[PDB]
């Protein structure tokens, strides 16, 4: 569902980019990730570690769906489920959620 991520432990709402990097740098591990709401309308970021570096990917909420690049999904939860199964960046998949404390 459209707002089902609001009770997912990997979703951190208005966590800042710096706060997200701090969390990802505590015990660095390729495949670690969290999702945050950006300070732009209808915009989220996946913050993650892949191939030894920390990166951020923008996700757009467009009407009822979400878009990552050219790929559309029904919802953020569906997007995250897909990228647990198929690579998000190079060969890295979402594997180790950083949970809200």
């Amino acid at each position: 569902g459209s707002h089902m991520h609001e009770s997912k432990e990997w979703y951190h709402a208005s966590l800042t980019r710096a706060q997200a990097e701090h969390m990802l740098m505590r015990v660095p591990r390729d495949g670690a990730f969290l999702v945050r709401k950006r300070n732009e309308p209808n915009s989220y970021a996946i913050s993650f570690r892949a191939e030894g570096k920390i990166k951020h990917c923008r996700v757009q909420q467009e009407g009822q769906t979400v878009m990552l690049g050219n790929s559309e999904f029904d919802s953020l939860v569906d997007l995250i489920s897909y990228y647990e199964k198929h690579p998000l960046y190079r060969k890295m998949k979402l594997r180790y959620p950083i949970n809200e404390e």
């Binding site: 970021a45 990166k55 951020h56 923008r58 690049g69 960046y89």
Partner: peptide
């Protein structure tokens, strides 16, 4: 100046 993974 936030750097993100390139679009597309």
């Amino acid at each position: 100046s936030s750097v993100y993974v390139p679009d597309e």
